[PDB]
Structures are given as C-alpha cells and as structure tokens.
Amino acid sequence: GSAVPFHGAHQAGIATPVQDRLHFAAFDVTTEDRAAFVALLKEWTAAARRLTAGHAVGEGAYGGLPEAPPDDTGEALGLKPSRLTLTIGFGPSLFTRFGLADLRPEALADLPKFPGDNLDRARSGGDLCVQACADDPQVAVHAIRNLARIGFGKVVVRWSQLGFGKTSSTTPDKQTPRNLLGFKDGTRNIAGTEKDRLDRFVWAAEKDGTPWMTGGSYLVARRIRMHIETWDRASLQEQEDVFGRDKGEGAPVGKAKERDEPFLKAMKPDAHVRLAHPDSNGGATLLRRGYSFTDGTDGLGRLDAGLFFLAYQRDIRTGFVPVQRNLATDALNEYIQHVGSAVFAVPPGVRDADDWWGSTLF
Amino acid sequence: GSAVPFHGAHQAGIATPVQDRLHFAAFDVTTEDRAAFVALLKEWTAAARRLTAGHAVGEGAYGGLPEAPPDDTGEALGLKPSRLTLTIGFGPSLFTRFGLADLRPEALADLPKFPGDNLDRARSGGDLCVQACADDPQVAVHAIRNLARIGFGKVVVRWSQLGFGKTSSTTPDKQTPRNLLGFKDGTRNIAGTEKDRLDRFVWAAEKDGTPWMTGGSYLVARRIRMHIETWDRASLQEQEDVFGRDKGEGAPVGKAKERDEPFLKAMKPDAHVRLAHPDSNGGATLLRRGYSFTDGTDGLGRLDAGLFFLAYQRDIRTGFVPVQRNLATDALNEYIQHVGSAVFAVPPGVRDADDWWGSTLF
Ligand code: HEM
Ligand code: HEM
C-alpha cells in the first residue's frame, strides 16, 4: 500500500520492486507547439506527484464548482498509493518534432527486423510512453486515464497494454513469479539493490554521448503472443528442454535449486537460457520487467495469452539487439510470436519539486 | 481468509465474500454425446476440488513421465488458494443438446431486446459458463485455462472477460468500492449474510417449477461499456444528477451518509437509483456481483472500460428483466452501452466428494 518516492536521479519504475499490475500507454503527439508540449510535460509532472502519493489531481474529485467537470475522475478516491510508479519515455518519432532531430540519442536505435516478426503497426511505436505500475489495477488505470485527459488536444493514446500479473523480478529475495508457460521468469535478472550492475548495464552515462540522457535508460517493449495450444500439447521434457531449467523448481538442468548457477554446456544448444545468457552474448545483460496478459479469446475457441516483454538497458545496441539476434535459433520460437514492438528513451529522474519530466531535453 | 469451501447446498461464488478478481468464461459444447459430456462434468468437478484448495489438477504440474504432457499447466505453482471459487452455469442453448429441451427452466428466460442494445454476438451467449473469482488473477486464469484444456475436444471457449473490484490487501472490507465512473457501487445490494433475502430473491425453490434447479440461481451477465471520455467531460452536477447520489460520499440527494435510505421523490425522475430501486419495480431486487473491466484502448483511442454486470436472481423474469426494462429512460444511458449479454441457469451446489456439477440435471 505504501508510496514509492517520485523524485530521484532516476525515474522510479525501473529498479523499483516489480508491482502486481501494469497499464502501459503509448501516445502520439498532435500539437506542433513546442511551448504547449513543454507545458503539458509540466502539468503531467505535477499530476504524477499527486497520483504517486495517493492524492487526486488538480483541485480534487469533488467539492468544486457544480457546473464544472471535476479535475480528477475520482475512481481512485479512498485508495492507497499502492506503489504506483509512472515512468515516461520518448520514442524515436518524437525527435522529428520541436527541433529535436539532433538530440536523438545514438543509443535509441531502431530495431532490425527479426525472423518471425509479425508486428502490428497499430500496436507498435509511439511518440512517447507512460508505464504505470501499481499493486491495484484501479490505481494504474486511474493514472493513465487522468494523464490522457489532461493531455487532450496535445496527445492521443496510440495503443495501450494492461498486464494482469508480473513475469519479472528486481527482488531476488522474493518468490519468482511464473509466466503463462508455467516457468519461473525473473530468476537471473538485475536486482534493484545491485547498484554496480545498474550503472554498468541499465543507466546511461554522460560519457556515452548524449548528455541529456545521463541517468536515464532505454526501453524495449515487445508484445509476444504465446501458442498455448501447441505448448500445452508438449511433453514435460520438451518444455524443460526449451528453457534449460526444470519446471517445478526452476533450477538449471542437472541442479537442485532455482538460484544455483546455470552450467550452460549441460543445456541443449538451442535452449532459451543458454542463448540468452550474458556469457553467450559478450556479457550483454538486461533488466527484464515484463508482465503477462490475456486479451480475451482468439475467436477460434481458445484463450489468448502472451507476455508483454519490457527490457531496460544502457544502450539498445548492446543490450536487446545482440541478445534477440542470438535467439534466432531459440527452441522457444516454436511457441511464441512477436506481434508488437516499440523503443523509448527513458529520461533521467525528476530531481525535486521544481523539476519536470524531460527538462534535460527541453 | 485463504480458501472458500467448494462443497455445499449452493455453489460458492454467489453468496460468498466477493473476491478481488474475476475471470469469466463462456464455453460452447462441441460434442453431441451425452455420456462424454457427463464424463467431462465429472472430470471438471474433480479438477475444481483441487483448484479451489490450491492444488494442481490431476497428477500435477511436474514430476510425472517426462514424455507426457503435464496434467496441470503449472502457472499457479507456489500460489495460495486466494479464495478461488468456481461457479458453473448452463445457458439456454445447452438444452438443445443431449435431449434436454424439456428440462430447460422457465425461469431461464430469453432476454428481450432492450433500447440501445448493441450486442456483439461473439461476446454473447454460450452453452456454459465458469465464473472464476479469486484475489489473485493468475489463480483465476490458471483455473479457466486448465478447465479449457481438460475439456478440449468437447468444449471450446466462446468468450472470456477479466475483471477487477477492490484490492483487499490495501482496501478495507467495509469500504464500498467505486466503479470507473467514480461513484460508490454496491451500497444497496443483497448481502451474502441475508439468508432470508437470499431465499426470497436469489435461490430457486422446489415449488418454482424446475426441481433440478432447487438451490440454484439464475445469472444475467452484461458487458457494459462506459463512454469514459464523454462522462469525464460532464459537470459534477450532471454526474450526480444521473445517479441521485453525490459523488464524494455517495449519499442519496438530500441525505448525509452513504447508507441513508434514499428519498426517491428528491431525485430526478430518470435518475438511475430511482429507476432501479425495488419500490419502482414492484419489489424486484437483485444480488449484484459485478466487476469492473478495462481491456485496453479501442481503435479510436478511447478507453475500453466499463462494468461487467453480473446479477443473480430466483427468476430472470422477476429480477433483471423488470429492472432493466425500467432503465429505458435512465439518464445513465447517454454514457453506457450494453455490448455483451448472456443468461445462465446456475445449478445447486456439489453436496460432497461423490457429487458432481450438473448431477441433478443429468
Ligand atoms: C514469451 C517469451 C519469453 C518467455 C516465456 C521467456 C522465459 C524465460 C525463462 C523461463 C527464463 C529462465 C528464468 C529467468 O532467469 O528469468 C528466461 C530467462 C531469460 N530470458 Fe526469456 N523469455 C521470453 C522472452 C525473452 C526475450 C525476448 C528475451 C531477450 C530478447 C529474453 C531474455 C532472457 C534473459 C536475458 C534471460 C536470463 C538468462 C540468464 O542470464 O540466465 N527472454 N526467459
Ligand atoms: C455501467 C453501468 C452501471 C453503473 C455505472 C451503475 C451505477 C450504479 C450506482 C452508482 C448505484 C448506486 C449505488 C448502489 O446501490 O450500487 C447503482 C445502484 C443500482 N443499480 Fe446500477 N449501474 C449500472 C448499471 C445497472 C444495471 C444494468 C442494472 C440492472 C439491470 C442496475 C441496477 C442497479 C440497482 C438495482 C441498484 C440499487 C438501487 C437501489 O435499490 O437503491 N445498474 N448503480
């Protein structure tokens, strides 16, 4: 129920412990007025300060003038902060506006086409994103809804994704959640307490070449459908062979405990963990922070299910891209398909009550 | 509270405490063989006993023959029962199979077309339903997913709806939840503690005309989309006039506290509470047990959210039908649209370990 501090050198919602629920929204910018967009960013930052503390935006949800719409839509009244974090990011397409072309970070790289990609352009891309994570889904939806309302006429929601449950962990002292394939997901990630690994693999540094991004990160989002019917037909041995870990304990093959270190040579050459491991990718390491989703049925008699994959890294070119390239032969590919994609530059944190989202860029 | 007893004179999930999350699935039957369908009901009931106790179905999720698919898909391993209830219901279309046409209860009435209906046929109807309620959405999804898997070849999933109410870890039990219009939702309802009211308004009685339904109930499901962005542009006074209660406290107009009894005469004539109140409907009273939903963003950039309405009643003709008919002029109609509908006969409870879902019918 507690609040997560909004201010810091970094935005919350990255190294923060992973909350139960996600509402991810991608926005496109509809205004050409740089000043009006900067004003929006300040208004959004002010609202985010209220929302993450459990307060209503503006002058509140009721008690104002009867003839005016309330400033806050009111469905979070009486609710605790619920560890709400709000994380903003800027997509490549933003930098074609407002005279920003020369400020696009080199580390904000467009993703190549990958084998098997079946990307829906409507559920991909976006000028900017807001990742809302909280333990209460109503608190998360309330935040996105009120940011979008405040932004009416300056931004429109391009697409959004809800995650009903996490499939990641930044807290290895807590139980690792399972994805909808039934495997623990998050065992060998970067923990929020591992400051040295966050500096090396997650946070952008001044010497990296883009000063306004110092203290920020780069986000890759991949909407991944799972072929549940095919998976659920597979034998237990086939499933464990796909990953290189056993299903029950989640230990590396041959070992007894989840957090025992993998011995990669004991795994099949196309095992997911073997191909995605840093040792197999020149040391490339990611902070995974994804969530599960199900968006109804496929219309053909089956549940739809997937994983909304989110990875934070210091440089997309040295994080997601090499690892995903190495997954070209992944045995998992038989059971999944990437159907949505987006990359964002996540700016540094809001330092204090005078600062605002994107101040280092604008 | 950890688990909710599965066995009883009534199915759990109706009068039992309302859990934080919903996964509602409608199934269509694909087999013509009555014996095969009875076998499935027995297998499902065995699975449900395991699931509601927090155990895996069948021989488990791991540790079986390596060359065999696991009996349980495994994504609920390590989770608690989370107050899971599983409630099955039979739709009108089921009674066109297996020679059951003369056993369809008269109280399982087809709903008339209502003004403003915009029903998606693909998200309506269904031969069967399973209402999975729990505090952990992964527990509920795992239940539906495994029931669907066990039934593969005999049933398919027609449509599926995830929903949420309050988050109990952070929200007191005595506090009324708010719907996504920001108003308290549930103040004047039948509570599961009111045994006499349940006997009068909710449970089917032997003398009602269908003996196999004694101790059962009748369920109406309506997927009601809210026009969120239009609602949020309405003035505070307009919103309160729509309902006849104030937004902050939820008290009836002219009264001071949420639970003060309404003075209907002081509300506008087409106020929602005034039109839906039992005194306006010849005494008709419902057990409302619905959930909020938010499924994402639609093609126009609007929030796909609303109320997944669920009502239980002794007879659809004397519960939902008269009340919904009286909402023909509801001021709320400007802001909502009914887009899915289904009705189900919910059979009596599973009395003991040898009983099975549907045994009184088959
Ligand atoms: C539906 C899609 C996916 C599923 C079900 C899945 C599942 C898993 C599982 C079960 C593990 C072992 C437990 C763990 O350490 O977290 C794992 C590890 C990992 N995955 Fe995935 N994964 C998926 C997609 C991806 C993608 C797209 C990437 C990167 C492009 C990725 C990168 C990693 C990494 C880096 C590890 C840790 C390997 C290590 O250092 O030991 N995964 N994944
Ligand atoms: C999105 C759609 C709806 C919304 C937002 C909504 C909202 C509300 C609100 C705020 C209340 C007052 C608090 C309460 O007692 O729960 C209420 C009461 C009620 N509503 Fe609705 N409602 C909706 C649809 C319906 C429908 C479809 C029905 C029946 C067909 C219905 C029947 C009732 C009843 C019986 C009451 C209690 C009236 C009383 O006895 O005081 N509602 N509703």
Automatic annotation (TrEMBL), chains A, B:
The keyword Iron applies. GO terms for molecular function: ferrochelatase activity; heme binding; metal ion binding; peroxidase activity. Its main location: other. Residues 176-350 form the Dyp-type peroxidase C-terminal domain. Keywords: Heme, Iron, Lyase, Metal-binding, Oxidoreductase, Peroxidase, Signal. It is found in: Cell envelope. It is an enzyme of class 1 (oxidoreductase). Pfam families: Dyp_perox_C (PF20628), Dyp_perox_N (PF04261). Involved in the recovery of exogenous heme iron. Extracts iron from heme while preserving the protoporphyrin ring intact. This is Deferrochelatase. It comes from Streptomyces coelicolor (strain ATCC BAA-471 / A3(2) / M145).
